[PDB]
Design a protein around this ligand. Structure first.
Ligand SMILES: *[C@@H]1O[C@H](CO)[C@@H](O[C@@H]2O[C@H](CO)[C@@H](O)[C@H](O)[C@H]2NC(C)=O)[C@H](O)[C@H]1NC(C)=O
Ligand SMILES: *[C@@H]1O[C@H](CO)[C@@H](O[C@@H]2O[C@H](CO)[C@@H](O)[C@H](O)[C@H]2NC(C)=O)[C@H](O)[C@H]1NC(C)=O
Ligand SMILES: *[C@@H]1O[C@H](CO)[C@@H](O[C@@H]2O[C@H](CO)[C@@H](O)[C@H](O)[C@H]2NC(C)=O)[C@H](O)[C@H]1NC(C)=O
Ligand SMILES: *[C@@H]1O[C@H](CO)[C@@H](O[C@@H]2O[C@H](CO)[C@@H](O)[C@H](O)[C@H]2NC(C)=O)[C@H](O)[C@H]1NC(C)=O
Ligand SMILES: *[C@@H]1O[C@H](CO)[C@@H](O[C@@H]2O[C@H](CO)[C@@H](O)[C@H](O)[C@H]2NC(C)=O)[C@H](O)[C@H]1NC(C)=O
Ligand SMILES: *[C@@H]1O[C@H](CO)[C@@H](O[C@@H]2O[C@H](CO)[C@@H](O)[C@H](O)[C@H]2NC(C)=O)[C@H](O)[C@H]1NC(C)=O
Lengths: 336, 158, 336, 158, 158, 336
C-alpha cells in the first residue's frame, strides 16, 4: 500500500500577509486587532484613578483644595492614574484670585499628576525671617472656616509688618524643603486694591513691583490698582481688591529668589509631590465603573486582543497598542 | 492527510481506497508553537518601564508639541514594528508546516523498515495491505514491519 | 549516468555582509544606497510646496501678508509642504514695526507651517466692548490702500477713545474664535512715540505698561518714548513713532488676558490655521522644478533606491532614509 | 548545475561528458522571493503616519535642541534597524539556496524511481544514458523511468 | 554522539559496545556561528551616531522633563529590542543544532555507500564491524566502502 | 554495525528562554548581563573628560573662568565628555554678582557641554558705537589683576559716558560674531547701587529699566537700589552695590536687541563654543583613574558584557546598555 505523511486540506477562511509568500489562504486565523467601543470612565482594576483631588470633602473644587482653603483641608487619596476633567479649574471659596493673569490656573492639574500629594507642615519661609520684624498673617474675612471664624489660605499668608509707606524692596530666598524624591510646589502673590485702600493698609498709592527667579525663569509683575475684573470665583460678595498669584516649583538642590515691595503675600505652606502618574483628559468617573484601560477618545475599554484599529490617543493601564490595519495570525494549515 | 481530528496525520491509499488517521501530538505541538509566537507578540504592548514626570497641557505650545511629537513617533514606530513582526510570524508559522511534515516523514522512514520505497513526497510503498489498524500503529509509534511480513533493519551485531 | 541537482557557479562580483557567514561572495547584488545629487527646490509631485505665502500678490513680502497689509490681502494657496526661505522675514509696507524687539519676526514662519491659512472675518475683540466706549480705529496715513486712501492694518487697530490722560489700566479677555481643529493667531501691540506726540494723541508723556497672559506665559513691556532705531521696513519716509507688537497663539478651549494702559493697539483680525504640514529650510522654488523629495542639504532629489549615504538633514515627501554605510542585497547564487 | 539560462538547474555527467539544463520555475521562485524581501525593506521609509504641529526654528535654543534630538534619535535608530534587516535578509536569501536545492533533490528522488542510488549530495546514479533529452524531461517534470528501462515505484494495489 | 572532544560527532554501537569519535570542524562551525550571533548583539549598544547640543540641567522643569522622557523612551525601547533579539538568537542557535546533525547525516549517506540502510534517525547499518578506525576515517572524510567489503556507488560510465 | 550522527549529551547548567521552545535546558550559556560596580570618576581611555574648566589655573572657580576674571584667563583643554560637579557654581573673584537673581548661575555648566571653548578677541559691541560717544570702561577696584592693579571683567564692561542724568533709553543690536558652526555666549548686565551712589556715578536715584530680546525670548529687569543681599562670592570686603547679569546665546544668523537706561554694563568679550559633548553629573575626577564608561549612578565602569542589570542613568563612552532581566545566550548543545 502507499502510506503518506502530510497535512490535511480544508476550505480557506482567511488570507494572511507574509514577507515572501504574498497573501496566503489559510483555513483559520486569529484576529489580533479590534475596534474599541467607548465606555464610561472609571478605575483600572489595578488601583485608584484620582479624578477629584479630595473626593470626601464636599462643597469644594479642586482649585480650592490646591489653595488649602480653610474648609477644604481634607485627605487626598493615592492614585495610579488621574483624569483631567477641568481645563480651567475654578475657585469657589476665599478671596478672589486672578487666576487667568498668571500661571496658577493649572495648579490642580499639577498636583494630580503625582501618586502622592502631601501637605507639608510649616511655612516655606518663616514669619520670623522677614525684614520688617513683627510680621503677622492677617485673617481675610472672606475666608470663613467651619464656624464662621475669619481665616486665611493655608498656602498663602496676607502679610503686614510694623511700618507703612514705600520701601526700596525686600529679598527672600526659598530653598527646597521636601524629601530628596519630592518636588515642592509653592504659591505666593500680591494684594492689589484701590489706591485709597492700598494707602490705608500699606501706605502706598501706586503699583508695587514683584519679582521672582526660579529654575523656570524670571517672573515680574506690577499689579494695577483699581479697575478690577468683575468679581468671580469667590465666596465674597464685595471684595474691592484682587489677589495676583504666582506658582513656583522647586526640585531637590534648587533655590529661588523673591524680590518684593509692599503688598506682598507670602508662602504659608507648600505641597510635596512624590512619584509621577499617567494623566489623561476625560470625563469624571462613573460610580462603579471598572475597565482595563482609560483611553482619551474611548472611555474605559477592554483588551480582548493586544492591538486595536481605531482613533489614536493617549492611554493608561493594560491598554492595546494602535496599529493602522487589521492583523491576522495563522492558526491552521495552508489552504488547498 | 489527516483531519480525522487534528491538522497533522497519515493516510493509506490502495485497494481499500483511502483511510486516514491523525497524529494529535504533532498537531498539538504546532498549536503550542503558534500560541507561543502569539504570546511573544503580546509583550510589545508592555514596553513602558519608566514613569517620568508628565508634561501638563495648557502650557507653552512648543512644549506641548514636543510632548505630542514624542508620543506620535513612539506610536508610529511601534505600529510599524508590530506589522513587520506579524508578517514574519506568519511566514515562520507557514514554514513550520513543512518542518512538521518532514518530521513525520522521518518517523515513517524508521518505522516502515528498509524495504519501503521512499517516493520523495513523504509517501512510502509497502508490500502489504495497510487498513486502519496500520495507521493507528503508525500514529501510536508501535508499527513493527515484521508483524506484516516485511523486512526489518539489520541488527548492529555481526 | 549521474544526474545532479544544485545551483550553478559564476564569478563573484559583490560581497555581502551576513549575520553568521561573514562577507559572502556573490555573483550579483543590488545596491540599496545612493549618494544624493543636489537639485533645485520645487514641488513634490503629490502637491504644492507653499514657498511664498501669497505668490499671486506682487510687491508684497510674507511679513506684509501676515500683517494683513491693505494692499497684500490676497489668496493663500493650500500646500502639502513649505520652504523657509527667510530667517528674518521683513516688512516693506505700512507703519514701521520693531519686529526685533518682540516675537513677531517669525509670524510668517508660523503661518506657513499649516496646510490651510484662513483670514477670519471679524475683530478678535469687538470695538463696542472696550471700556472707553466710543472707540474708533484711526487710519494711519502711512498705510495707503490701492487708490492712495489712508488705511490700517487688517490685523491691528490703532485705537483711541473719548478721553486723554493717564489711566489705571484696562483689562480684556480674548477667547478662541476659530473651529475646534484650528489654532488662532493674534497680533496686538502698542504705539510708541515722542513724549510730545504721546501727549498730543493720548494725554501721556511717560512710558505706559502693557501686559498679556496667554498659554505661552506672561509678557510685559513698557515701550521707551523717543530715541527710536533708524526708520526701516516701512513705506513711510518719516514716522516719528514706532509700533511694538506681540504675537499670541490660542488653541481650542484657551483664553488670554491683555492688560493695557494708553497707547494700546488692539487685535483687528486674526488667522485660523488648520492641518500642520512639514517645513524645511531652503531656497525659493525654481519655476517648473518637480522632484520626489525636498531635502535641507540637497534640493529636490529622486529616490532611485530606498536608502541614501550622504549628509543627514530633514526631508519632506517620498524621501530615502539615511543609513551609515553602503548596503548590498543578494540577487544571485553564492560565488564559487 | 544550471545557467544554461537561470540560476537553478540539473546536470548529467557521464560517458558523454557533462550536459546541463536549467529549471526556470525554481529560479523564478527564488527571484520573486528576493524581490519580495526587498519590497518589505522599502516600507521602513514610510513609517511617518502622524503629522503634528512642527516646531519652528529661530526659537528658544533648548526647544530647538529637543526637536533636533528627537529627529536625530529617530534617524539613528532607523539606520541601525535598516542595517540589521539587510544583514538578516542576506542570510535568509543565502539559506534559500539550500532550500531550493533540497526541493530539486526531492523532485529527482521521486522522478528517478526506486532504483536510483541517492548519493546524499543531490546526485543520483541511473543505469541509462542521460543526454539532454533526459534533462529536458527532468526539468519539465515528464521523466518516466520505464522510458529508459528503469524500474518505477511499486503501485499501492496489492 | 560526540564529546570525545567537541559537541558534534559520530558513534558506532555493536558487538564491541559503543565507540565514539567527534567532528571538530562542524563543532567549530557551530561555535563560530554562535560567536558571530553574539557579535551582532554587541552592535545594539553603539547606535548613537549624532551628537546634538545637550539639554542642560537646572532649567525649566518641562524642558528637563522632555529631555528625560526622550532618554527614557529610547532606553525602554532598546531594552525591549535586546530581550527579543536574545530570545530569537537562542531559538536560531538551537535550530542550528539540527541543521548541523542533518549535514552530518548527509556526509554519512554519501560515505557509507548504496548498501547502508538509512534508518531515518541519522543512523546507518553497514554489514561490517566499525571499531574506532572507521570512526576516524568517517570524521576525516576518508572512509571508502570497498575497504570493508561493502558496495560503493555505481560509476556514471555505462 | 550501526553508525550514527548526532550530538552528545551532558548535564544541563543553564536554562535559556526561547520564542517557542520555552525555557530550554542547555549544557552551557554566556551571561550577557552584569551588575555594575561603582568606581571613581576619571577619563574614558578615548580622551579627556573636562571636569574643571581650567585645571591649570589654580585659585579660581569655574564661574571665575566663565566670567573672564583678570587672574583666571587660562587655557581650557578640549574634552570628549564633561562632568557637572557643581549644581550652583560659585564666584570667588571680582565684584559681587547676584547670580541667583538671573540666569547666569549656570554659565559654567553651558560652556562645559561643548568640546571647544574659545575666548573670542574683541568686544561683542564696540565702545565707539555707543550713543554717548566717549564711552570708557572703568576699572572696578575689586578686580585686581596679578600685580594688584585695578582691572575689569574680560567679558563685562562697566560703562560710563560724557553725561549724567536720566535718559529715555538707548538701543543696541548684537549680531552673531563666531564661525558658522559656533554658538556665541554673551554676558551683559546692570550696576545697582545705593541711590546716593547711583546719583553720584550716573545722575539717577531711581531704578532704571533694562530690556533684552534674543531668540530665547524677552527679558526685562528694573534692579532695586539698596537693601542688597549680604555680600558673598566676591574678593571685595565692602562693595556697597551689586551687579545684575543676563546670559544671552546666539547661533549663526541670529540677532538680539538690548534696550538699556543708565547703569548698563555692556558685553566686553564673548565665548564661541563649537562641537557639543556628552555631560553627566558626578564627582570630580580621581587623579589617575581611567574607565571605559562614566555612568551617573556608578562612577567609572568597565564593559565586561554588552548589557547590565542595575540602576538606570545616563552614561558616556563605551557603555553597556540597560536591560530589565538577566540574559543568557546558548553556547552549547541542548541538555538531555
Ligand atoms: C479583524 O478585526 C478588524 C478590527 O475589528 C476588522 O476590521 C473592521 O471591521 C469592521 C466591520 O466588522 C469595520 O467596520 C471596521 O472599519 C474594520 N476596521 C478596519 C481598520 O478596517 C476586520 O474585518 C476583522 N477581520 C476578520 C477576518 O475578522
Ligand atoms: C487555534 O485553533 C484551535 C482550534 O482548532 C484552538 O484550539 C481550541 O481552543 C479552544 C479554546 O478557545 C478549546 O476549547 C478547544 O478544545 C481547542 N481545540 C483543540 C483541538 O485543542 C486554538 O486555541 C487556536 N489557537 C489560539 C492561539 O487560540
Ligand atoms: C553602492 O552605492 C554606494 C553609494 O552610492 C557606493 O558608495 C559610494 O561610492 C562613491 C564612488 O562611486 C564614493 O564617492 C562614495 O563616497 C561612496 N559612499 C560611501 C558611503 O562609501 C558604493 O560604492 C556602491 N557599491 C557598489 C558595489 O555599487
Ligand atoms: C536580479 O537579477 C535579475 C537578472 O538575473 C533581474 O531580472 C531581470 O530584470 C530585468 C529588469 O530590470 C529584466 O529585463 C530581465 O529580463 C530580468 N531577467 C530575468 C532572467 O528575469 C532581477 O530583477 C534582479 N532582482 C531585482 C530585485 O532587481
Ligand atoms: C563557548 O564555550 C567554548 C568552550 O566549550 C568557548 O571556547 C573556548 O574559549 C576559550 C577562550 O575563552 C579557549 O581558551 C578554549 O580553547 C575554547 N575551547 C574550544 C574547544 O575552542 C567559546 O569561546 C564559548 N563561546 C563564546 C562566544 O565565548
Ligand atoms: C547572570 O548575570 C546576572 C547579572 O549579574 C545575575 O543576576 C544577578 O545575580 C546576583 C547574584 O550573583 C544578584 O545579587 C543580582 O540581584 C542579580 N541580578 C538580577 C537582575 O537578577 C545572574 O544570576 C547571572 N546568571 C548566571 C547563570 O550566571
Amino acid at each position: 500500500d502507499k502510506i503518506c505523511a502530510g497535512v490535511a486540506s480544508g476550505k480557506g477562511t482567511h488570507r494572511v500577509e507574509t514577507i515572501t509568500k504574498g497573501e496566503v489562504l489559510v483555513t483559520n486565523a486569529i484576529n489580533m486587532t479590534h475596534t474599541p467601543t467607548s465606555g464610561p470612565f472609571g478605575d483600572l482594576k489595578t488601583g485608584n484613578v484620582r479624578d477629584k483631588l479630595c473626593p470626601t470633602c464636599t462643597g469644594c473644587t479642586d482649585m480650592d483644595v490646591a489653595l488649602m482653603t480653610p474648609t477644604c483641608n481634607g485627605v487626598i487619596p493615592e492614585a495610579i492614574a488621574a483624569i483631567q476633567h477641568e481645563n480651567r479649574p475654578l475657585q469657589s471659596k476665599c478671596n478672589p484670585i486672578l487666576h487667568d493673569l498668571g500661571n496658577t490656573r493649572q495648579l490642580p492639574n499639577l498636583l494630580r499628576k503625582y501618586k502622592k500629594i502631601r501637605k507639608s507642615s510649616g511655612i516655606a519661609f518663616p514669619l520670623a525671617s522677614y525684614a520688617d520684624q513683627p510680621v503677622i498673617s492677617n485673617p481675610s474675612g472672606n475666608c470663613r472656616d467651619g464656624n464662621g471664624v475669619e481665616s486665611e489660605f493655608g498656602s498663602l499668608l496676607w502679610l503686614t509688618g510694623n511700618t507703612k509707606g514705600a520701601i526700596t524692596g525686600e529679598t527672600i530666598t526659598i530653598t527646597h524643603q521636601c524629601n530628596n524624591d519630592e518636588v515642592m510646589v509653592l504659591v505666593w502673590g500680591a494684594w492689589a486694591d484701590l489706591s485709597a485702600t492700598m494707602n490705608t493698609i500699606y501706605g502706598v498709592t501706586t503699583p508695587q513691583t514683584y519679582v521672582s527667579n526660579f529654575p523656570s525663569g524670571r517672573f515680574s509683575m506690577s499689579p494695577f490698582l483699581g479697575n478690577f475684573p468683575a468679581l468671580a470665583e469667590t465666596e465674597a460678595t464685595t471684595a474691592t481688591g484682587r489677589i495676583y498669584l504666582r506658582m513656583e516649583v522647586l526640585e531637590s538642590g534648587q533655590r529661588g529668589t523673591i524680590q518684593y515691595q509692599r503688598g506682598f503675600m507670602g508662602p504659608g505652606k507648600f505641597w510635596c509631590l512624590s512619584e509621577p502618574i499617567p494623566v489623561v483628559k476625560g470625563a469624571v468617573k462613573t460610580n462603579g465603573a471598572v475597565s482595563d484601560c482609560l483611553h482619551e477618545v474611548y472611555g474605559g475599554i477592554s483588551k480582548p486582543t493586544p492591538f486595536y484599529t481605531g482613533n489614536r490617543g493617549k492611554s493608561v493601564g493594560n491598554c492595546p497598542k494602535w496599529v493602522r490595519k487589521p492583523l491576522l495570525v495563522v492558526n491552521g494549515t495552508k489552504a488547498r | 492527510d489527516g483531519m480525522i481530528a487534528g491538522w497533522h496525520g497519515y493516510s493509506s491509499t490502495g485497494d481499500h481506497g483511502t483511510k486516514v488517521a491523525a497524529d494529535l501530538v504533532s498537531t498539538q505541538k504546532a498549536m503550542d508553537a503558534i500560541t507561543a509566537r502569539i504570546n511573544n507578540m503580546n509583550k510589545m504592548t508592555e514596553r513602558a518601564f519608566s514613569v517620568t514626570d508628565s508634561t501638563m497641557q495648557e502650557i507653552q505650545k512648543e512644549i506641548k508639541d514636543l510632548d505630542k511629537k514624542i508620543d506620535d513617533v513612539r506610536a508610529d514606530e511601534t505600529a510599524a514594528q508590530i506589522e513587520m513582526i506579524v508578517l514574519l510570524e506568519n511566514e515562520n508559522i507557514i514554514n513550520a508546516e513543512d518542518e512538521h511534515v518532514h518530521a513525520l516523514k522521518q518517523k515513517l522512514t524508521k518505522m516502515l523498515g528498509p524495504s519501503a520505497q521512499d517516493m520523495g513526497d513523504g509517501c512510502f510503498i509497502v508490500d502489504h495491505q495497510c487498513k486502519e489498524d496500520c495507521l493507528r500503529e503508525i500514529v501510536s509509534g508501535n508499527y513493527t514491519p515484521s508483524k506484516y511480513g516485511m523486512d526489518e533493519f539489520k541488527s548492529p551485531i555481526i
